[PDB]
Tab-separated table of C-alpha atoms (C1' of nucleotides) and ligand atoms in Angstrom:
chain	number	residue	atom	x	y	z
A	544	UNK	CA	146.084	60.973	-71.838
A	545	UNK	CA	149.563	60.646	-72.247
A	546	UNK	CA	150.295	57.310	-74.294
A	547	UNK	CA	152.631	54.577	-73.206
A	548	UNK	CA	154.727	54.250	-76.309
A	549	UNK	CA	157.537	57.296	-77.458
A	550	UNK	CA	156.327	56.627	-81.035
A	551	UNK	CA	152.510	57.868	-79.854
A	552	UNK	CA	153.885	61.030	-78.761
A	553	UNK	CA	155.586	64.086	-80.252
A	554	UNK	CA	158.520	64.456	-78.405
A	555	UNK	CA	160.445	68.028	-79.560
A	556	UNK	CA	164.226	68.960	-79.554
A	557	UNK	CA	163.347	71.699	-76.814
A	558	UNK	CA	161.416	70.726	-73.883
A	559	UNK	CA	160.093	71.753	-70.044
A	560	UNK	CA	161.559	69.437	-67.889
A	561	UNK	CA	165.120	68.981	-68.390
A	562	UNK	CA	166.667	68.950	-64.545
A	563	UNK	CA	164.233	65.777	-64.079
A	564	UNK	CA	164.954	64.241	-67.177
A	565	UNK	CA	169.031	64.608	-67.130
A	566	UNK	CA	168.415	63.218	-63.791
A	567	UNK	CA	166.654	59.642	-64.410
A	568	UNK	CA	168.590	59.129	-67.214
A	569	UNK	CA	171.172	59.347	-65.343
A	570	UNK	CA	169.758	56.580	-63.048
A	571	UNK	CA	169.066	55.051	-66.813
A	572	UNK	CA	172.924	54.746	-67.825
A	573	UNK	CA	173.838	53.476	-64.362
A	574	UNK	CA	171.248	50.154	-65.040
A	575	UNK	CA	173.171	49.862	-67.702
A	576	UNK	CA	176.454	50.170	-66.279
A	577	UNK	CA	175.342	47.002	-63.782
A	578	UNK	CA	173.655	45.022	-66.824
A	579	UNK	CA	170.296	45.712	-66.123
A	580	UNK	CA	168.570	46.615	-69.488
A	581	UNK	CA	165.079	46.538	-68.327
A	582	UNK	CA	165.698	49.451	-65.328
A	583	UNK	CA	167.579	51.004	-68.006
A	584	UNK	CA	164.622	51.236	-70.230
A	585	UNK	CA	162.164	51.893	-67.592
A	586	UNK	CA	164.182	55.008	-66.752
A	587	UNK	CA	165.003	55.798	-70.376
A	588	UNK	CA	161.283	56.083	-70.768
A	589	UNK	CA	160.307	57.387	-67.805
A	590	UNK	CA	162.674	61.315	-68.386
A	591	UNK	CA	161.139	60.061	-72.002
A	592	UNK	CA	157.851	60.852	-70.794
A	593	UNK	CA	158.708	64.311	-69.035
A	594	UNK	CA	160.094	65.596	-72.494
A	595	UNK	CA	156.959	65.395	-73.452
A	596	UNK	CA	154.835	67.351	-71.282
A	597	UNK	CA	153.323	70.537	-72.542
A	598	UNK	CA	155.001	72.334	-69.402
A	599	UNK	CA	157.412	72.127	-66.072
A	600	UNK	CA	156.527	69.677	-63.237
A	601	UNK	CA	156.040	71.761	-60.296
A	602	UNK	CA	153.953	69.232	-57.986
A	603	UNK	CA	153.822	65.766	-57.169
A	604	UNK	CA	150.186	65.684	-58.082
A	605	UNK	CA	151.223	65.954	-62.325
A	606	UNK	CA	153.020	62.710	-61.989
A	607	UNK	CA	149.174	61.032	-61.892
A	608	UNK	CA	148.892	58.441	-64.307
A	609	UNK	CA	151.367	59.026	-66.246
A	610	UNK	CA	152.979	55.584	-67.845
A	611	UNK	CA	156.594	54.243	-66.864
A	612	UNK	CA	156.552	56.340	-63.107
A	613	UNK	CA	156.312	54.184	-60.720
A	614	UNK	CA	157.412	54.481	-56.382
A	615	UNK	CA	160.825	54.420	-57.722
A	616	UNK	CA	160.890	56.826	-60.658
A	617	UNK	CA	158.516	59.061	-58.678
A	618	UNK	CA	160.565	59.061	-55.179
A	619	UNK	CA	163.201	60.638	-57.383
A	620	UNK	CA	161.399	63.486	-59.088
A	621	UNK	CA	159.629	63.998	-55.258
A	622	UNK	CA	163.404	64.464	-54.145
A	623	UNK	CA	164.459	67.087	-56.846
A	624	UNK	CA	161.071	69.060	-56.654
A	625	UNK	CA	161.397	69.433	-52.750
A	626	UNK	CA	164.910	69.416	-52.411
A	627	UNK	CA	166.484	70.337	-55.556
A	628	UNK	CA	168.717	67.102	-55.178
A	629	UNK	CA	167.837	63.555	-55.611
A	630	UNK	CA	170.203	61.622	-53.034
A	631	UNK	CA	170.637	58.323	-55.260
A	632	UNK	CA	171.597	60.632	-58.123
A	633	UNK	CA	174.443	62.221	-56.603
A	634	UNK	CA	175.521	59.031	-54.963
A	635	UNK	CA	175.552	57.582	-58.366
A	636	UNK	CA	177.260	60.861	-60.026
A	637	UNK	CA	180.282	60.806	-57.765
A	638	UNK	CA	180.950	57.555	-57.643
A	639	UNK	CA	184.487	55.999	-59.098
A	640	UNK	CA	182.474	52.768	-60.673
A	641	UNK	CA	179.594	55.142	-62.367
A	642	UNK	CA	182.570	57.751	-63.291
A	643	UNK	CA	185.017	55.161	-64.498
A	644	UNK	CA	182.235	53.013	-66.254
A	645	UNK	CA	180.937	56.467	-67.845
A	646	UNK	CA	184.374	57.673	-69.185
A	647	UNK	CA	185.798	53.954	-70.777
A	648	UNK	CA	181.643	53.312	-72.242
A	649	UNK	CA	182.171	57.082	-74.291
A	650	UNK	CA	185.149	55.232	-76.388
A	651	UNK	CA	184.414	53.976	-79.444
A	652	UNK	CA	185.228	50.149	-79.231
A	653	UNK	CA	184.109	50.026	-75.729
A	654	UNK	CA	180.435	49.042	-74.079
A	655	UNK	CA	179.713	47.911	-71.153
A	656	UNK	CA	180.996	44.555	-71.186
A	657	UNK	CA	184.276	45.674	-71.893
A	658	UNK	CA	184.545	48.739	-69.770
A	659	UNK	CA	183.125	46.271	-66.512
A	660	UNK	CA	185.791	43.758	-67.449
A	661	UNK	CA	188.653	46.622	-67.334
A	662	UNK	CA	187.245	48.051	-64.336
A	663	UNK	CA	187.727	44.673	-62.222
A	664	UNK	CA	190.799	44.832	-63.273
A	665	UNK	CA	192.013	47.965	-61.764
A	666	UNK	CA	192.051	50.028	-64.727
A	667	UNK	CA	190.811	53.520	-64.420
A	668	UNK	CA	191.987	56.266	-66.560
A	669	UNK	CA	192.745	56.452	-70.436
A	670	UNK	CA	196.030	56.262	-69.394
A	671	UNK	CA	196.260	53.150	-67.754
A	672	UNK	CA	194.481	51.406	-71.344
A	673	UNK	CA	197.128	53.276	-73.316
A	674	UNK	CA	200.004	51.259	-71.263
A	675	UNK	CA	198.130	48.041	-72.358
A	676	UNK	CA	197.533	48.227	-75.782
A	677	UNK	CA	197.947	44.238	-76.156
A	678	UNK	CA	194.300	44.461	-74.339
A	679	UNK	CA	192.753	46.362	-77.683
A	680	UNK	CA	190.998	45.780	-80.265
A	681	UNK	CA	191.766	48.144	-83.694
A	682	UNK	CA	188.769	49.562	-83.466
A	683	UNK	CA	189.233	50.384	-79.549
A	684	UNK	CA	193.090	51.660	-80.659
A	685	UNK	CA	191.391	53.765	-83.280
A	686	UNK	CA	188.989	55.471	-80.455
A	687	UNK	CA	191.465	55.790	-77.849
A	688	UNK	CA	194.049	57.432	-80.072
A	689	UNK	CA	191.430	60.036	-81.498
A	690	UNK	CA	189.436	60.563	-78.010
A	691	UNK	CA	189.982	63.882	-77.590
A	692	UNK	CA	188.945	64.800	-80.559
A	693	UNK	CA	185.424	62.680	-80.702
A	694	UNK	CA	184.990	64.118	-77.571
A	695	UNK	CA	184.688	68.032	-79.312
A	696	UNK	CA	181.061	68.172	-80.649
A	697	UNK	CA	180.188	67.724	-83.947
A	698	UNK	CA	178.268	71.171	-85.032
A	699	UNK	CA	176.747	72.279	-88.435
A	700	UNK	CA	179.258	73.447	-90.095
A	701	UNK	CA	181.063	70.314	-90.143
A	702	UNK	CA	178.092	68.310	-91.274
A	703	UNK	CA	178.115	70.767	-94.420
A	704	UNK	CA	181.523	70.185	-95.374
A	705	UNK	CA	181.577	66.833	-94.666
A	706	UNK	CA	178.611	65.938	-96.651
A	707	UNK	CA	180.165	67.422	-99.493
A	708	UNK	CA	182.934	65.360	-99.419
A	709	UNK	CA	180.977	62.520	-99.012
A	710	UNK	CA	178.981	63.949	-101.870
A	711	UNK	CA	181.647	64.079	-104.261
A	712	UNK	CA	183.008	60.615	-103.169
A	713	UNK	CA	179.423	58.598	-104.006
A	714	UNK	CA	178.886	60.708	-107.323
A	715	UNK	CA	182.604	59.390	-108.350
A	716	UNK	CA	181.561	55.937	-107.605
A	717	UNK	CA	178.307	56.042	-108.878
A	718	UNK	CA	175.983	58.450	-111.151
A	719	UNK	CA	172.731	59.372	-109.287
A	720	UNK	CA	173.481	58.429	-106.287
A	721	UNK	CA	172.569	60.546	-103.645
A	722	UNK	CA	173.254	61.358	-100.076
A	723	UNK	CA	170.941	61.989	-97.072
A	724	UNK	CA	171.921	63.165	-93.791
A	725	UNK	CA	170.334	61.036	-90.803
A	726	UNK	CA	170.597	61.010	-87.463
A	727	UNK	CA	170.130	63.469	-84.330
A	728	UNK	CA	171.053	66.286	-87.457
A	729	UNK	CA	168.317	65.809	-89.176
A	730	UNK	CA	166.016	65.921	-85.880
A	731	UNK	CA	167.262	69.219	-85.472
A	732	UNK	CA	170.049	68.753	-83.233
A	733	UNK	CA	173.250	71.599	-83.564
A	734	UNK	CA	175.820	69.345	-82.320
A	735	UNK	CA	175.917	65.178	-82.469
A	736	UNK	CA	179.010	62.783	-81.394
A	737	UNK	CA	178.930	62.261	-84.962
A	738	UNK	CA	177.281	62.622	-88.827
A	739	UNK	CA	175.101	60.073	-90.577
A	740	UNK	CA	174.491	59.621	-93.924
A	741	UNK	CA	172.302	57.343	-95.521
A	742	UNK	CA	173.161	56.591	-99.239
A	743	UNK	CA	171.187	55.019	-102.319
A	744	UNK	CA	170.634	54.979	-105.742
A	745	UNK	CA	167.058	55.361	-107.718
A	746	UNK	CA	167.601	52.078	-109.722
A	747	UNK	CA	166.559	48.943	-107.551
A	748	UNK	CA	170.463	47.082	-107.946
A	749	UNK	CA	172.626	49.578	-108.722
A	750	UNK	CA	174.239	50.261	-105.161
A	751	UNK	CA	175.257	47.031	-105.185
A	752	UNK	CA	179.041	46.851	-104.295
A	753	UNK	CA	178.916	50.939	-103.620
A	754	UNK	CA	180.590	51.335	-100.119
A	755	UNK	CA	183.928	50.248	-100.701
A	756	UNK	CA	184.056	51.927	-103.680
A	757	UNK	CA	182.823	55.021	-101.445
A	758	UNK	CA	185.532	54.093	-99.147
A	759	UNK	CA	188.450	53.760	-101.150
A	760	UNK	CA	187.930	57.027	-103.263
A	761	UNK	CA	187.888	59.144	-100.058
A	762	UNK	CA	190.978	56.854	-98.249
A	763	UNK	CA	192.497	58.092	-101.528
A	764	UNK	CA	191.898	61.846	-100.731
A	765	UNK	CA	193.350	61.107	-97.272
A	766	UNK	CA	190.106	61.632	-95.413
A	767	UNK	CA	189.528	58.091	-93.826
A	768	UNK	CA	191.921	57.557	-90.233
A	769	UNK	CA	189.718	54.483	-89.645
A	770	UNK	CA	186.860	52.090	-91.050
A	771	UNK	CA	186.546	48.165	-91.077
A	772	UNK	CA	181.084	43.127	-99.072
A	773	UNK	CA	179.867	45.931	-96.881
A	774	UNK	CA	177.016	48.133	-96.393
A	775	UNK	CA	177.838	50.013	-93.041
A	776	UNK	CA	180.705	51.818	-92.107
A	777	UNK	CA	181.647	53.384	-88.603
A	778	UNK	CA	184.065	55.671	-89.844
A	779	UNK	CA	186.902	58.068	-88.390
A	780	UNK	CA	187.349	60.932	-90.762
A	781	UNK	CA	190.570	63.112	-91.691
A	782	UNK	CA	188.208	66.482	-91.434
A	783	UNK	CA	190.467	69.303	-92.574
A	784	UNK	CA	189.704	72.434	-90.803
A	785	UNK	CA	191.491	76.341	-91.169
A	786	UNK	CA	195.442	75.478	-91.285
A	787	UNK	CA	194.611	71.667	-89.647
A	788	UNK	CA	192.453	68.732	-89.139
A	789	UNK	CA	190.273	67.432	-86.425
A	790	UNK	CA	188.544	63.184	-86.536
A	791	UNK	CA	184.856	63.017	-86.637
A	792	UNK	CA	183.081	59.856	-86.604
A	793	UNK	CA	181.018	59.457	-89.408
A	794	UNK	CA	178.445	56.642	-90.212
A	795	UNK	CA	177.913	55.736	-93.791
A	796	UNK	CA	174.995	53.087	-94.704
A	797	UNK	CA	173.926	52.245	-98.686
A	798	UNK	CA	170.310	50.893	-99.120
A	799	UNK	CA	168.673	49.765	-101.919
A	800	UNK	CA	166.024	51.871	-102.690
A	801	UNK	CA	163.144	50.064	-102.267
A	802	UNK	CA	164.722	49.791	-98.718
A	803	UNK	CA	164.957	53.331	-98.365
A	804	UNK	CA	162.194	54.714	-96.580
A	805	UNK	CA	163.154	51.816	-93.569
A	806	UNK	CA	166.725	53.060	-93.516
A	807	UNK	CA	165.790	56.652	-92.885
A	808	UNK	CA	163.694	55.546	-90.275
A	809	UNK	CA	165.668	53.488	-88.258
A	810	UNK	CA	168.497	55.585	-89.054
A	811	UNK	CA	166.798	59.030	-88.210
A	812	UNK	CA	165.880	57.731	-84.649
A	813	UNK	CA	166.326	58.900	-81.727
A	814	UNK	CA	167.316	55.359	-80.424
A	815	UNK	CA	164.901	55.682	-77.875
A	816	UNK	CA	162.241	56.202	-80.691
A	817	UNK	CA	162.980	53.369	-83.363
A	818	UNK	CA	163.193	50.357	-79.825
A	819	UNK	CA	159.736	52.028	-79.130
A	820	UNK	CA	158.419	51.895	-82.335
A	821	UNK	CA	159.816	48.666	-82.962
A	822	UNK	CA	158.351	47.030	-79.887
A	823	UNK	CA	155.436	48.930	-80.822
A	824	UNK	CA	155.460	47.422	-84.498
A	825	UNK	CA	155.707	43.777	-83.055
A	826	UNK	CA	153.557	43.698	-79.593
A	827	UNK	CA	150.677	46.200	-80.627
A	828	UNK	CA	150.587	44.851	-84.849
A	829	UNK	CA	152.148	41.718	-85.423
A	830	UNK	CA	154.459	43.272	-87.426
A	831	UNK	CA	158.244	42.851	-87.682
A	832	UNK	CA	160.251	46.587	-88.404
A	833	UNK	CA	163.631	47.232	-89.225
A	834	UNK	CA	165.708	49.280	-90.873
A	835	UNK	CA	164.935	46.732	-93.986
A	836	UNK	CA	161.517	46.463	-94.361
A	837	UNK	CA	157.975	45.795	-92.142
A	838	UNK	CA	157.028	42.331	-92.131
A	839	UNK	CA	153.528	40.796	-91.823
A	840	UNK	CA	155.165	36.962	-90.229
A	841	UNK	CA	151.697	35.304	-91.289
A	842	UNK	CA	151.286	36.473	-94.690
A	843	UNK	CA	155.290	35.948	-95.301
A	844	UNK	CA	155.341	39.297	-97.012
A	845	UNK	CA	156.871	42.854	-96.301
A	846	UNK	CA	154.995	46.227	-96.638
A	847	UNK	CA	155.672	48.113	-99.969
A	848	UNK	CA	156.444	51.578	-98.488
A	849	UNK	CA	157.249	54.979	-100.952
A	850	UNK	CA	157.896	57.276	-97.621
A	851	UNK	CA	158.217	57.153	-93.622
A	852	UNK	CA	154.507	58.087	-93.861
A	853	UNK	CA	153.809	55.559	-95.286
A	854	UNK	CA	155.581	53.050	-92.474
A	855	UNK	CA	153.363	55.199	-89.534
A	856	UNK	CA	150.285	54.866	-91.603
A	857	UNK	CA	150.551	51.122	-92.010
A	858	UNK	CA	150.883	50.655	-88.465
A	859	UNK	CA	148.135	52.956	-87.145
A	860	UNK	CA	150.002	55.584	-85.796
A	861	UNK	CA	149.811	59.442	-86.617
A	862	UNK	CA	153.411	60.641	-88.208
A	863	UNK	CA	155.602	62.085	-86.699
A	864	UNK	CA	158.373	64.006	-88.355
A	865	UNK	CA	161.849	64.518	-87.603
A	866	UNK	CA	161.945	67.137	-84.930
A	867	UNK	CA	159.244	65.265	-83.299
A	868	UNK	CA	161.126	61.993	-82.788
A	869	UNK	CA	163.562	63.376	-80.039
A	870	UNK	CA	162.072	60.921	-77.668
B	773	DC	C1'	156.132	35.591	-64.322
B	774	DG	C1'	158.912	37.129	-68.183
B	775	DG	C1'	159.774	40.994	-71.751
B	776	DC	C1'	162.338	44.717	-72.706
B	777	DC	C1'	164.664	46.717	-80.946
B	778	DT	C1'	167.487	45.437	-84.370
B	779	DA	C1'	170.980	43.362	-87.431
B	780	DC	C1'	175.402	44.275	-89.650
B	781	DG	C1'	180.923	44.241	-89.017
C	1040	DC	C1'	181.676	41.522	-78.647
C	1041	DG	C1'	181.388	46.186	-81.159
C	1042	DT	C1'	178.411	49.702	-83.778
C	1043	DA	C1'	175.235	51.875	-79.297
D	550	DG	C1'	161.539	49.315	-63.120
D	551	DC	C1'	157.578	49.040	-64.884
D	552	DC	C1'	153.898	46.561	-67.239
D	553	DG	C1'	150.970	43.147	-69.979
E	1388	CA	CA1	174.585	60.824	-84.867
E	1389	CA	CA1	175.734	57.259	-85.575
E	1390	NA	NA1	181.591	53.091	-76.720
DNA sequence: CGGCCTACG
DNA sequence: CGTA
DNA sequence: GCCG
């Protein structure tokens, strides 16, 4: 019953099975950690799945059938219903490699590649990368010197007053532009790592050249601490709060608008959502998605689309809004 | 056996 | 590589 | 790790 594909399935912000989900994904993040993408993905879609069944897993027997469980996938849930504790989960959890791997990955400027590299080299805390900072990138330097602050959560009412600001900036740039927020936010989430905005214009042209005039009107007001033709931005922002500040990464992306529709959808995710409905695009339709346009590789030609409705309906699937993509 | 999302900065 |  |  239950398809194989996130992007078949609503998946809500609130779900039933939470202990078994936390728990393969953390299995999920430690693939990752050892560069295997495809366990990573199995496992990703796997606690995927258990977000979203109608109710808890209590037995063994509910596991049946369903897509992406497998002996390994289901050993662990078998553990944590009988036991309460899966034993390769807290082997993995309290190790120094999944630890140290988990703690360099979270900075922004560092994957996996980089954090792997710096842990065969002995390093281990945020300290010991702050006594080397020959070994960074600006981007990393950027990340490490506002950690503790992109480590607070990003909550509502610093989405408001940031998308003002980021308001104010595009309308100074350019009349009728406009400003959506994307990302886990507009899913529903309370709290993100950080805000996305997705930014166009109504005339087919006129964004052209936008973000660094976004850019330099708010580095003018003092709000950028770090970004760097353009049409992305990973930003660190200069949020001023009661009496002080606090960083918050912000993402800023300008579309045309005949793009727009695409943009919101990739950008809207959840990441697990837009590779399933990606690989879904290309394996089940022949069709080639981004967060550009849907394109039909025999024809040569790309699917005029007015909405995100529009994208499910041309590839067969029933929509799914926001709150339903928290796959 | 091999595939596993995508492309910009 | 990073965004991730 | 799971699947076409
Ligand atoms: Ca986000
Ligand atoms: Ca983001
Ligand atoms: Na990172």
């Amino acid at each position: 019953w239950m398809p194989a594909y996130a992007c078949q399935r609503p998946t809500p912000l609130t779900h039933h099975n939470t202990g078994l989900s936390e728990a393969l994904e953390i299995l999920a993040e430690a693939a990752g950690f050892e560069g295997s993408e495809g366990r990573l993905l199995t496992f990703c879609r796997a606690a995927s799945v258990l977000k979203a069944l109608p109710s808890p897993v209590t037995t063994l027997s509910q596991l049946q059938g369903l897509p992406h469980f497998g002996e390994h996938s289901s050993r662990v849930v078998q553990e944590l219903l009988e036991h309460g504790v899966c034993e390769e989960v807290e082997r993995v959890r309290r190790s120094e490699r999944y630890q140290t791997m988990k703690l360099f990955t979270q900075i922004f400027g560092v994957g996996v590649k980089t954090a792997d590299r710096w842990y065969r080299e002995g390093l281990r805390t945020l300290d010991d990368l702050r006594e080397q900072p020959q070994k960074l990138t600006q981007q990393q330097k950027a990340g490490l010197q506002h950690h503790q602050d992109l480590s607070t959560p990003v909550l509502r009412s610093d989405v408001d007053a940031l998308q003002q600001v980021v308001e104010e900036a595009v309308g100074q740039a350019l009349p009728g532009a406009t400003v959506t927020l994307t990302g886990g936010f507009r899913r529903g989430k309370l709290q993100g790592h950080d805000v996305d905005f997705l930014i166009t214009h109504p005339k087919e042209g006129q964004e052209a050249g936008l973000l660094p005039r976004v850019m330099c009107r708010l580095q003018d007001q003092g709000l950028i601490l770090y970004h760097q033709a353009f049409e992305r931005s990973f930003c660190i922002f200069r949020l001023p709060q009661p009496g002080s500040w606090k960083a918050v990464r912000v993402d800023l992306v300008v579309a045309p608008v005949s793009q727009f529709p695409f943009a919101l959808l990739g950008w809207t995710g959840s990441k697990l959502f837009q590779r399933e409905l990606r690989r879904f695009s290309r394996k089940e339709k022949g069709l080639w998605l981004n967060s550009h346009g849907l394109f039909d590789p025999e024809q040569k030609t790309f699917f005029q689309a007015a909405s995100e409705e529009d994208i499910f309906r041309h590839l067969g699937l029933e929509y799914l809004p926001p709150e339903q993509r928290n796959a």
